[PDB]
Design a protein around this nucleic acid. Structure first.
Ligand code: DTP
Ligand code: MG
Ligand code: MG
Lengths: 414, 555
DNA sequence: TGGTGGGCGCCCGAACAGGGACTG
DNA sequence: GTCCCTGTTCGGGCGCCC
């Protein structure tokens, strides 16, 4: 047998105890079918109620597939797992990945079931399948092999992935292949079609080792940043200048170069909001400086791996969303937009989660690390629906915030 | 018999030892029931006498069962439970009659002495030491321990539940198309087989059960709608709840109340339009279960209203997978809501009430969205899918809201329903400043030390007022100023405030508040024809923020 | 007459958890 | 830091079932 590898939790920390949330008939049917099969192949085993631990599960319907994918929300366990992340992984992040014409995401999660999982850790990977209308109690399982979605899994399997891939990388040194959790990211500057042929070629290797081997066609170089922007106007009203001065006072925490004084001078007195104020040539020029100070990129922002990325998102309306990624406040690393169908049936929640899968996907590609999201939505709404729209094998930490109606007005686009 | 199933290995919590607790005095009646129970159990090897090897002891008692004839032997293992390892519980929730679909034949079975037919971990047996006192002249008396699950132990229910699922597993595999709703030891069994073939199958089940040590006495519902199950009576085409009897005290008390609400909430699953807001309110500051409380005129009324609605004959129906789930929601008062779920129009599957208040400030459209939310998760439990809705809210009101709201929000597929009271937005903030409307620059300040404040405004037309406030806070003074400008302006007005706090509340378009102050504001906002609220950074000399800030700073 | 256990539900009140605004 | 205000969680009582 392939030798088992000793795996600990972080000191002082106890395994996950998160209650399973309700699933749809559709989903349970799948989970049950998938699970009895994993059990038949010895990958997971029934367990009882004296195992104290638990971690929710569900399923996704990848692409237009007839195939369901089990997804075990493991981010609790992962949080609490000893750092192989740091203590048992030596991975530099492929900076060249962020710059490839095309990048395809393959799900190599399956190759994990080949390695057995440390006997003593197993009880921590426990999960429970629900039944419709509670016709039965929950049916509990735990892993024997390496679970997909457990951060331990890529670390443990690292060695063998390097063996398996080594030949393919050797011949395609211009192809960069990066692993993250269940995911293999593969980038080429090939023209699509030959790239795609390279991806089916890589899948032919990942089959000669088994067993066996969605989210297709990223382009890290078609991405771009969204600046803060100032309106252009022929006549300005008190209200215009009041909104202008408010936007900048804040923008100045990001770009300390921004100046407001002269524009404020126009807002002397106590004027009616709709009164038109002529822009004294200096303030007319101060709006020229700032307008440029906003162009020179934010200074002095260095990525620290030992801190989480934070992601703030704002609903901009009419299908529009804005995000910023930072680690310290006002020190953005990237800041972007995300537009969508302004149709009649726009589903705010579905977009929110398509927004967080894109923003995550970028973060992984750029830093190899998941961002923590500050979501502009109610906890319950979000939890009622988000998995109906998930397509990723990973799940980012998040927290819900009621964003100040102000912060949106700053990043808003013209 | 005792189930031949293997035991579930349990531990005490690390460093902890099993209980040493004196038996408290038992009734005579109860002691006779106990030795009667204990000697028969002991004969069957479910308990066995221990000696001075066992240092432990935990108190034991009995109560009558539902049939009131038989006695239940309990054990107060509060001490031991406290020291027992944790379990992941596996009863995820409670099966509902509205989740049953029609079956051609139906049986309900209950198991004999269920817990006592399931073995307990050998190594743990010692901690379950108890002692049945006898007549003080005839016996010490006898000291036993459990070789099976005790009724009172923290680990029993989960282990029984697991073991039953284990035990039934094989039968279910052989019989994937016979449905067994398994609640602890209470089995609902349904099929699409003719009576006599079903009945055969029932006999296979009892024998399978019996082969695993589980006896099924009668106690067995048969050719016998109505079936008594899980608190209901199941008839072939309809189900109802076993009659609910609300108390009739004339000096209700916290406990009388907490149990009045209890029953009504239970009731609301099938009785439409039950409300418990005014009643629940009474429950507020009171510090003791016993604390007797006088009814408010409206709780008084509310209760009367519920009383009359229970007087009515209501049933539910069984679920038809080949048909939509429909949920219709009515608005009640006071952030209270009723829904009814059905597939055919006047044949309810079940009903319900959402009344919870989230948030200091909110409006009807947010609540309605929360009612929808909750009803969705519930449907997904009970039927494992989502219902189509019937909401008392115009498509327009929603579209407006969803555009105006800076948060993501969404309601699944729905349709409008002319059933008042309709849900509306009770007023609209302008997006652009209003031409020809007096502009108010408002502000507040409060002395943190003395709690003394001023709130006021300067307007562009030359007027300016300051109100002194006492015992206030910064935020309150700023809400106060916004309130003053509304009071002293026409149907159309522009207000400039330097206060994110206050700007964030009013922008969210509340129609309800815990705050008496924010209420008074809401009233004014409804009276007005056009309001526009813009923000500006404070202490930045942006007059006339400059100016009104100067007026309200005598603190 | 009390005195036990687990599940789910509902309410309510405590402990926190943040943000925002203050002081000189 | 300090006050506020607001949100979350948890636990307690009651209901119902076994
Ligand atoms: N008040 C209670 N305290 C602790 N456990 C209980 C209580 N009520 C029920 N249970 C658990 C223990 C039982 O073994 C199981 C089955 O309930 P029930 O069928 O009504 O009694 P029973 O199965 O033990 O004997 P029987 O039903 O033949 O009279 O439910
Ligand atoms: Mg029984
Ligand atoms: Mg102010």
């Amino acid at each position: 047998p392939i030798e088992t590898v000793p795996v600990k939790l972080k000191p002082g920390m106890d395994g996950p105890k998160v209650k399973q949330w309700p699933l749809t008939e559709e989903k349970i049917k799948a989970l049950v079918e998938i699970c009895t099969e994993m059990e038949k192949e010895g990958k997971i085993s029934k367990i009882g109620p004296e195992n104290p631990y638990n971690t929710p599960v569900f399923a996704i319907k990848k692409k237009d597939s007839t195939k369901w994918r089990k997804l075990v929300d493991f981010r609790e366990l992962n949080k609490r797992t000893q750092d192989f992340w740091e203590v048992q992984l030596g991975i530099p992040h492929p900076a060249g990945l962020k710059k490839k014409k095309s990048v395809t995401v393959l799900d190599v999660g399956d190759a994990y079931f080949s390695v057995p999982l440390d006997e003593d850790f197993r009880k921590y990977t426990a999960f429970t399948i629900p039944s419709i209308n509670n016709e039965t109690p929950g049916i509990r399982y735990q892993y024997n092999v390496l679970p997909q979605g457990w951060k331990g899994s890529p670390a443990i399997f690292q060695s063998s992935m390097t063996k398996i891939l080594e030949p393919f990388r050797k011949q395609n040194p211009d192809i960069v292949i990066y692993q993250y959790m269940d995911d293999l990211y593969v980038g080429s500057d090939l023209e699509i079609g030959q790239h795609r042929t390279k991806i089916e070629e890589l899948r032919q290797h990942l089959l000669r080792w088994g067993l066996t081997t969605m989210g297709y066609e990223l382009h890290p170089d078609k991405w771009t940043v969204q600046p803060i922007v100032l309106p252009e106007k022929d006549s300005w009203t008190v209200n215009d200048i009041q909104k202008l001065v408010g936007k900048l006072n804040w923008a100045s925490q990001i770009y300390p170069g921004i100046k407001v004084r002269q524009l404020s001078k126009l807002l002397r007195g106590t004027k009616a909001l709709t009164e038109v104020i002529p822009l004294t040539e200096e303030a007319e020029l101060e709006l020229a400086e700032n307008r440029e100070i906003l162009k020179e990129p934010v200074h002095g922002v260095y990525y620290d791996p030992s801190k989480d990325l934070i992601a703030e998102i704002q609903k901009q309306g009419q299908g529009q969303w804005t995000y910023q990624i930072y680690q310290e406040p006002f020190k953005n690393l990237k800041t972007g937009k995300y537009a969508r169908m302004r149709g009649a049936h726009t589903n705010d929640v579905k977009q929110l989660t398509e927004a967080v899968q894109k923003i995550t996907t970028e973060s992984i590609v750029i830093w190899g690390k998941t961002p923590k999201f500050k979501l502009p939505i109610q906890k319950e709404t979000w939890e009622t629906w988000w998995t109906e729209y998930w397509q990723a094998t990973w799940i980012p930490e998040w927290e819900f915030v009621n964003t100040p109606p102000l912060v949106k007005l700053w990043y808003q686009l013209e | 018999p005792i189930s031949p199933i293997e035991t579930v290995p349990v531990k005490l919590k690390p460093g902890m030892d099993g209980p040493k607790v004196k038996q408290w005095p038992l009734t005579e009646e109860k002691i006779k029931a106990l030795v009667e129970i204990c000697t028969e159990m002991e004969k069957e090897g479910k308990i066995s006498k221990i000696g001075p090897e066992n240092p432990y002891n935990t108190p034991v008692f009995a109560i009558k069962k539902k049939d009131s004839t038989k006695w239940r032997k309990l054990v107060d293992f509060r001490e031991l439970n406290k020291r027992t390892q944790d379990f992941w519980e596996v009863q995820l929730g409670i099966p509902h009659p509205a989740g049953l679909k029609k079956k051609k034949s139906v049986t309900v079975l209950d198991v004999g002495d269920a817990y006592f037919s399931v073995p307990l971990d050998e190594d743990f047996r010692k901690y379950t030491a108890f002692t049945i006192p006898s007549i003080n002249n005839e016996t010490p008396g006898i000291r036993y321990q459990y070789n099976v699950l005790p009724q009172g132990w923290k680990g029993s229910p989960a282990i029984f539940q697991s073991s039953m699922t284990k035990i039934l597993e094989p039968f279910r595999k052989q019989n994937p198309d016979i449905v067994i709703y398994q609640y602890m030891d209470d089995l609902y069994v349904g099929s699409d087989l003719e009576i006599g073939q079903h009945r055969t199958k029932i006999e296979e089940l009892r024998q399978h059960l019996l082969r695993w040590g589980l006896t099924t006495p009668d106690k067995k519902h048969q050719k016998e709608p109505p079936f008594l199950w899980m608190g209901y009576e199941l008839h072939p085409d309809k189900w109802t709840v076993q009659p609910i009897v609300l108390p009739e005290k004339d000096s209700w008390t916290v406990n009388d109340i907490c149990k009045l609400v209890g029953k009504l909430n239970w009731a609301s699953q099938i009785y439409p339009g039950i409300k418990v807001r005014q009643l629940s309110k009474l429950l507020r500051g009171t510090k003791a279960l016993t604390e007797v409380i006088p009814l408010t005129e409206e709780a008084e009324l509310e209760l009367a209203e519920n009383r009359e609605i229970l007087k009515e004959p209501v049933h539910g129906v069984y679920y038809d997978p080949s048909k939509d789930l429909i949920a219709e929601i009515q608005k009640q008062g006071q952030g209270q809501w009723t829904y009814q779920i059905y597939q055919e129009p006047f044949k309810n599957l079940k009903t319900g009430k959402y009344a919870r208040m989230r948030g200091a400030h909110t409006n009807d459209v947010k609540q309605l969205t929360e009612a929808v939310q909750k009803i969705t998760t519930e449907s997904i439990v009970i039927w494992g899918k989502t219902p189509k809705f019937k909401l008392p809210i115009q498509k327009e009101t929603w579209e407006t809201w969803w555009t105006e709201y800076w948060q993501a929000t969404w309601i699944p597929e729905w349709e409008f329903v002319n059933t008042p009271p309709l849900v509306k937005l009770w007023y609209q903030l302008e997006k652009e400043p209003i031409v020809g409307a007096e502009t108010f620059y408002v502000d507040g300040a409060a002395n943190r030390e003395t709690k003394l404040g001023k709130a006021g405004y300067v307007t562009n037309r030359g007027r300016q007022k300051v109100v002194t406030l006492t015992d206030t806070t910064n935020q309150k003074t700023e809400l106060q100023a916004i309130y003053l400008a509304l009071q002293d302006s026409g149907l159309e007005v522009n207000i400039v405030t330097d206060s994110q706090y206050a700007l964030g509340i009013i922008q969210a378009q509340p129609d309800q508040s815990e705050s008496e102050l924010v209420n008074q504001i809401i009233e004014q906002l409804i009276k007005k024809e056009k309001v526009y609220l813009a923000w500006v950074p404070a202490h930045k000399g942006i007059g006339g923020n400059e100016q009104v800030d100067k007026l309200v700073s005598a603190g």
